[PDB]
PDB file of C-alpha atoms and ligand atoms in Angstrom:
ATOM      1  CA  UNK G   1     130.695 301.767  99.660  1.00  0.00           C
ATOM      2  CA  UNK G   2     131.808 303.932  97.248  1.00  0.00           C
ATOM      3  CA  UNK G   3     129.189 306.714  98.121  1.00  0.00           C
ATOM      4  CA  UNK G   4     130.686 306.710 102.064  1.00  0.00           C
ATOM      5  CA  UNK G   5     134.100 307.114 100.545  1.00  0.00           C
ATOM      6  CA  UNK G   6     133.283 309.969  98.201  1.00  0.00           C
ATOM      7  CA  UNK G   7     131.320 311.545 101.048  1.00  0.00           C
ATOM      8  CA  UNK G   8     134.565 311.014 103.231  1.00  0.00           C
ATOM      9  CA  UNK G   9     137.118 312.664 100.603  1.00  0.00           C
ATOM     10  CA  UNK G  10     134.169 315.623 100.302  1.00  0.00           C
ATOM     11  CA  UNK G  11     134.603 315.746 104.044  1.00  0.00           C
ATOM     12  CA  UNK G  12     138.220 315.857 103.885  1.00  0.00           C
ATOM     13  CA  UNK G  13     138.454 318.554 101.472  1.00  0.00           C
ATOM     14  CA  UNK G  14     135.948 320.763 103.096  1.00  0.00           C
ATOM     15  CA  UNK G  15     137.803 320.702 106.463  1.00  0.00           C
ATOM     16  CA  UNK G  16     141.063 321.426 104.358  1.00  0.00           C
ATOM     17  CA  UNK G  17     139.656 324.369 102.808  1.00  0.00           C
ATOM     18  CA  UNK G  18     138.334 325.227 106.074  1.00  0.00           C
ATOM     19  CA  UNK G  19     141.560 325.212 107.770  1.00  0.00           C
ATOM     20  CA  UNK G  20     143.134 327.164 105.187  1.00  0.00           C
ATOM     21  CA  UNK G  21     140.850 329.912 105.633  1.00  0.00           C
ATOM     22  CA  UNK G  22     138.717 330.198 102.407  1.00  0.00           C
ATOM     23  CA  UNK G  23     136.062 332.729 102.265  1.00  0.00           C
ATOM     24  CA  UNK G  24     134.559 331.298  99.060  1.00  0.00           C
ATOM     25  CA  UNK G  25     134.239 327.455  99.366  1.00  0.00           C
ATOM     26  CA  UNK G  26     132.891 325.429  96.195  1.00  0.00           C
ATOM     27  CA  UNK G  27     132.317 321.888  97.015  1.00  0.00           C
ATOM     28  CA  UNK G  28     130.675 319.638  94.577  1.00  0.00           C
ATOM     29  CA  UNK G  29     129.906 316.224  94.778  1.00  0.00           C
ATOM     30  CA  UNK G  30     129.095 314.064  91.757  1.00  0.00           C
ATOM     31  CA  UNK G  31     128.481 310.235  92.010  1.00  0.00           C
ATOM     32  CA  UNK G  32     129.902 308.211  89.286  1.00  0.00           C
ATOM     33  CA  UNK G  33     127.680 307.819  86.074  1.00  0.00           C
ATOM     34  CA  UNK G  34     126.526 304.264  86.349  1.00  0.00           C
ATOM     35  CA  UNK G  35     123.410 302.754  85.223  1.00  0.00           C
ATOM     36  CA  UNK G  36     120.401 302.155  87.501  1.00  0.00           C
ATOM     37  CA  UNK G  37     120.440 298.316  87.298  1.00  0.00           C
ATOM     38  CA  UNK G  38     122.265 297.847  90.451  1.00  0.00           C
ATOM     39  CA  UNK G  39     123.100 301.205  91.797  1.00  0.00           C
ATOM     40  CA  UNK G  40     119.817 302.606  93.070  1.00  0.00           C
ATOM     41  CA  UNK G  41     120.101 301.787  97.094  1.00  0.00           C
ATOM     42  CA  UNK G  42     123.609 303.230  96.982  1.00  0.00           C
ATOM     43  CA  UNK G  43     122.229 306.116  95.142  1.00  0.00           C
ATOM     44  CA  UNK G  44     119.545 306.690  97.851  1.00  0.00           C
ATOM     45  CA  UNK G  45     122.432 306.556 100.452  1.00  0.00           C
ATOM     46  CA  UNK G  46     124.432 309.087  98.653  1.00  0.00           C
ATOM     47  CA  UNK G  47     121.401 311.290  98.727  1.00  0.00           C
ATOM     48  CA  UNK G  48     120.923 310.980 102.207  1.00  0.00           C
ATOM     49  CA  UNK G  49     124.617 311.394 103.139  1.00  0.00           C
ATOM     50  CA  UNK G  50     124.730 314.465 101.194  1.00  0.00           C
ATOM     51  CA  UNK G  51     121.494 315.564 102.902  1.00  0.00           C
ATOM     52  CA  UNK G  52     123.153 315.008 106.379  1.00  0.00           C
ATOM     53  CA  UNK G  53     126.504 316.750 104.971  1.00  0.00           C
ATOM     54  CA  UNK G  54     124.952 319.908 104.304  1.00  0.00           C
ATOM     55  CA  UNK G  55     123.724 320.746 107.733  1.00  0.00           C
ATOM     56  CA  UNK G  56     127.237 320.178 108.685  1.00  0.00           C
ATOM     57  CA  UNK G  57     128.423 322.243 106.214  1.00  0.00           C
ATOM     58  CA  UNK G  58     126.368 325.465 106.982  1.00  0.00           C
ATOM     59  CA  UNK G  59     127.552 325.148 110.436  1.00  0.00           C
ATOM     60  CA  UNK G  60     131.008 324.677 109.884  1.00  0.00           C
ATOM     61  CA  UNK G  61     130.928 327.556 107.257  1.00  0.00           C
ATOM     62  CA  UNK G  62     128.842 330.149 109.579  1.00  0.00           C
ATOM     63  CA  UNK G  63     131.430 329.393 112.157  1.00  0.00           C
ATOM     64  CA  UNK G  64     134.561 329.948 110.039  1.00  0.00           C
ATOM     65  CA  UNK G  65     133.278 333.213 108.675  1.00  0.00           C
ATOM     66  CA  UNK G  66     132.592 331.968 104.977  1.00  0.00           C
ATOM     67  CA  UNK G  67     131.464 334.649 102.899  1.00  0.00           C
ATOM     68  CA  UNK G  68     129.801 332.653 100.376  1.00  0.00           C
ATOM     69  CA  UNK G  69     129.531 328.755 100.256  1.00  0.00           C
ATOM     70  CA  UNK G  70     128.099 326.591  97.234  1.00  0.00           C
ATOM     71  CA  UNK G  71     127.164 322.763  97.761  1.00  0.00           C
ATOM     72  CA  UNK G  72     126.399 320.980  94.649  1.00  0.00           C
ATOM     73  CA  UNK G  73     125.361 317.461  94.433  1.00  0.00           C
ATOM     74  CA  UNK G  74     124.553 315.496  91.608  1.00  0.00           C
ATOM     75  CA  UNK G  75     123.540 311.726  90.870  1.00  0.00           C
ATOM     76  CA  UNK G  76     122.426 310.320  87.622  1.00  0.00           C
ATOM     77  CA  UNK G  77     121.506 306.554  87.231  1.00  0.00           C
ATOM     78  CA  UNK G  78     120.660 306.162  83.552  1.00  0.00           C
ATOM     79  CA  UNK G  79     118.060 304.027  82.179  1.00  0.00           C
ATOM     80  CA  UNK G  80     119.284 300.814  80.150  1.00  0.00           C
ATOM     81  CA  UNK G  81     118.166 299.769  76.665  1.00  0.00           C
ATOM     82  CA  UNK G  82     115.799 297.199  78.689  1.00  0.00           C
ATOM     83  CA  UNK G  83     113.973 299.477  81.044  1.00  0.00           C
ATOM     84  CA  UNK G  84     112.865 303.290  81.516  1.00  0.00           C
ATOM     85  CA  UNK G  85     114.137 302.960  85.159  1.00  0.00           C
ATOM     86  CA  UNK G  86     116.313 306.372  85.860  1.00  0.00           C
ATOM     87  CA  UNK G  87     117.220 308.215  88.638  1.00  0.00           C
ATOM     88  CA  UNK G  88     118.561 311.845  88.215  1.00  0.00           C
ATOM     89  CA  UNK G  89     119.246 314.334  90.907  1.00  0.00           C
ATOM     90  CA  UNK G  90     120.676 317.664  91.039  1.00  0.00           C
ATOM     91  CA  UNK G  91     121.073 320.086  94.030  1.00  0.00           C
ATOM     92  CA  UNK G  92     123.096 323.348  94.101  1.00  0.00           C
ATOM     93  CA  UNK G  93     122.907 325.749  96.760  1.00  0.00           C
ATOM     94  CA  UNK G  94     124.510 329.249  97.096  1.00  0.00           C
ATOM     95  CA  UNK G  95     124.557 331.302 100.476  1.00  0.00           C
ATOM     96  CA  UNK G  96     126.146 334.268 101.118  1.00  0.00           C
ATOM     97  CA  UNK G  97     127.165 335.396 104.700  1.00  0.00           C
ATOM     98  CA  UNK G  98     123.973 336.747 105.626  1.00  0.00           C
ATOM     99  CA  UNK G  99     122.382 333.634 104.337  1.00  0.00           C
ATOM    100  CA  UNK G 100     124.915 331.624 106.620  1.00  0.00           C
ATOM    101  CA  UNK G 101     123.975 333.809 109.567  1.00  0.00           C
ATOM    102  CA  UNK G 102     120.267 333.529 108.759  1.00  0.00           C
ATOM    103  CA  UNK G 103     119.966 329.676 108.418  1.00  0.00           C
ATOM    104  CA  UNK G 104     117.603 327.961 110.927  1.00  0.00           C
ATOM    105  CA  UNK G 105     119.736 324.778 111.464  1.00  0.00           C
ATOM    106  CA  UNK G 106     116.314 322.727 112.862  1.00  0.00           C
ATOM    107  CA  UNK G 107     114.051 323.835 109.750  1.00  0.00           C
ATOM    108  CA  UNK G 108     117.074 323.392 107.236  1.00  0.00           C
ATOM    109  CA  UNK G 109     117.380 319.606 108.319  1.00  0.00           C
ATOM    110  CA  UNK G 110     113.792 318.860 108.624  1.00  0.00           C
ATOM    111  CA  UNK G 111     113.410 320.049 105.214  1.00  0.00           C
ATOM    112  CA  UNK G 112     116.123 317.905 103.964  1.00  0.00           C
ATOM    113  CA  UNK G 113     115.055 314.690 105.620  1.00  0.00           C
ATOM    114  CA  UNK G 114     111.650 315.145 104.668  1.00  0.00           C
ATOM    115  CA  UNK G 115     112.598 315.839 101.015  1.00  0.00           C
ATOM    116  CA  UNK G 116     115.038 312.518 101.059  1.00  0.00           C
ATOM    117  CA  UNK G 117     112.190 310.700 102.712  1.00  0.00           C
ATOM    118  CA  UNK G 118     109.923 311.764  99.936  1.00  0.00           C
ATOM    119  CA  UNK G 119     112.497 310.594  97.169  1.00  0.00           C
ATOM    120  CA  UNK G 120     113.258 307.472  99.205  1.00  0.00           C
ATOM    121  CA  UNK G 121     109.505 306.462  99.062  1.00  0.00           C
ATOM    122  CA  UNK G 122     108.983 307.413  95.530  1.00  0.00           C
ATOM    123  CA  UNK G 123     112.181 305.150  94.516  1.00  0.00           C
ATOM    124  CA  UNK G 124     110.933 302.358  96.492  1.00  0.00           C
ATOM    125  CA  UNK G 125     107.420 302.505  95.248  1.00  0.00           C
ATOM    126  CA  UNK G 126     108.193 302.242  91.406  1.00  0.00           C
ATOM    127  CA  UNK G 127     106.546 305.383  90.777  1.00  0.00           C
ATOM    128  CA  UNK G 128     107.239 308.504  88.347  1.00  0.00           C
ATOM    129  CA  UNK G 129     107.917 311.845  90.149  1.00  0.00           C
ATOM    130  CA  UNK G 130     109.538 314.598  88.319  1.00  0.00           C
ATOM    131  CA  UNK G 131     110.122 318.191  90.217  1.00  0.00           C
ATOM    132  CA  UNK G 132     112.216 321.360  89.372  1.00  0.00           C
ATOM    133  CA  UNK G 133     112.614 324.051  92.032  1.00  0.00           C
ATOM    134  CA  UNK G 134     114.441 327.375  91.752  1.00  0.00           C
ATOM    135  CA  UNK G 135     114.480 329.836  94.923  1.00  0.00           C
ATOM    136  CA  UNK G 136     116.403 333.205  95.025  1.00  0.00           C
ATOM    137  CA  UNK G 137     115.944 335.405  98.182  1.00  0.00           C
ATOM    138  CA  UNK G 138     117.791 338.457  96.973  1.00  0.00           C
ATOM    139  CA  UNK G 139     117.549 340.347 100.586  1.00  0.00           C
ATOM    140  CA  UNK G 140     119.388 337.615 102.113  1.00  0.00           C
ATOM    141  CA  UNK G 141     121.484 336.356  98.935  1.00  0.00           C
ATOM    142  CA  UNK G 142     120.160 332.729  99.129  1.00  0.00           C
ATOM    143  CA  UNK G 143     119.759 330.912  96.028  1.00  0.00           C
ATOM    144  CA  UNK G 144     119.239 327.249  95.070  1.00  0.00           C
ATOM    145  CA  UNK G 145     118.326 325.015  92.119  1.00  0.00           C
ATOM    146  CA  UNK G 146     117.052 321.345  92.412  1.00  0.00           C
ATOM    147  CA  UNK G 147     115.860 319.134  89.560  1.00  0.00           C
ATOM    148  CA  UNK G 148     114.698 315.311  90.642  1.00  0.00           C
ATOM    149  CA  UNK G 149     113.300 313.033  88.290  1.00  0.00           C
ATOM    150  CA  UNK G 150     112.391 309.306  89.396  1.00  0.00           C
ATOM    151  CA  UNK G 151     111.051 306.933  86.545  1.00  0.00           C
ATOM    152  CA  UNK G 152     110.176 303.317  87.397  1.00  0.00           C
ATOM    153  CA  UNK G 153     109.476 301.220  84.402  1.00  0.00           C
TER     154      UNK G 153
HETATM  155 CA1   CA E 201     106.079 303.397  87.609  1.00  0.00          CA
HETATM  156 CA1   CA E 202     110.230 315.533  81.532  1.00  0.00          CA
HETATM  157 CA1   CA E 203     108.640 313.026  81.342  1.00  0.00          CA
END
């Protein structure tokens, strides 16, 4: 699938930047601009793979000594003239070295998986769910912005 290929290219670029010894890694994975008609399950797979990929990102950045890691994920299935069905998802995460040090992998994986499960449940059920989220821990230098908008006609 296209989502799996995008995830593989992102993995390879992340590993290439790790091997080169970078202290500032900025990974941005954007699903191609498509319509909601046929791509909803593929977008759900894209979100699931990005969620599973951020957990590996955090470990491989902390062990490599990365000083600042930014992971950005974006999917936008736009509505057609016929329906109001739409699926917008944007998740940006910025972690400093202390942030990478203080991340509990278990709680992080649980949070990502619960968020994705709620997204999948809302998308499958044809329900409306819109939420924005901005978090900033200044002491540990952890920040994230998340915007999700799920509409079923
Ligand atoms: Ca609805
Ligand atoms: Ca709105
Ligand atoms: Ca609205």
